[PDB]
């Protein structure tokens, strides 16, 4: 169920769009490594990870990763490692980048 709506998390931006996520992440109060989780604009329980990066060729750049939900419960960005919830996934990728453009550092500022 959802239920899984843990909007108690500082990094969860439920009803924000892709573009607004990019705009909020690129704001001056945030830096490279900033991130958020957002729900799909159409599909409930479908989520994305949005991450602020810095590329030597472009400026600040925002990268998006689709999060997949398995029907039995659980989440993954890479099928190499699944998590029992989004919050464990965040902690994992805060610990090591493990395929992402960089380690997750701070939640995007409200």
Swiss-Prot record:
Keywords: Adaptive immunity, ATP-binding, Cell membrane, Cytoplasm, Golgi apparatus, Immunity, Inflammatory response, Innate immunity, Kinase, Lipoprotein, Membrane, Myristate, Nucleotide-binding, Nucleus, Palmitate, Phosphoprotein, Proto-oncogene, SH2 domain, SH3 domain, Transferase, Tyrosine-protein kinase, Ubl conjugation. Detected in bone marrow-derived monocytes and macrophages (at protein level). Expressed predominantly in B-lymphoid and myeloid cells. GO terms for cellular component: adherens junction; cytoplasm; cytoplasmic side of plasma membrane; cytosol; glutamatergic synapse; Golgi apparatus; integrin alpha2-beta1 complex; membrane raft. Disruption phenotype: No visible phenotype at birth. B-cell development in the bone marrow proceeds normally, but mice have reduced numbers of peripheral B-cells, with a greater proportion of immature cells and an increased turnover rate. Dendritic cells also have a more immature phenotype. Mice develop severe asthma upon exposure to airborne antigen. Mice display elevated levels of serum IgM. Aging mice display strongly increased levels of myeloid cells, severe extramedullary hematoipoiesis and tend to develop monocyte/macrophage tumors. The modification Phosphoserine is found at residue 110. The protein kinase domain plays an important role in its localization in the cell membrane. This is Tyrosine-protein kinase Lyn. The gene is Lyn. The chain holds residues 119 to 228 of 512 of the full protein.
């Amino acid at each position: 169920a959802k239920v899984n709506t843990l909007e108690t998390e500082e990094w969860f931006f439920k009803d924000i769009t892709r573009k607004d996520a990019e705009r909020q992440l690129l704001a001056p109060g945030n830096s490279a490594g900033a991130f958020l989780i957002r729900e799909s604009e159409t599909l409930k329980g479908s989520f994305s990870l949005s991450v602020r990066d810095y590329d030597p060729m472009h400026g600040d750049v925002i990268k998006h990763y689709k999060i997949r939900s398995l029907d039995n419960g659980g989440y993954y960005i890479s099928p190499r490692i699944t998590f029992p919830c989004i919050s464990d996934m965040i902690k994992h990728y805060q610990k090591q980048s493990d395929g992402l453009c960089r380690r997750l550092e701070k939640a995007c500022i409200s």
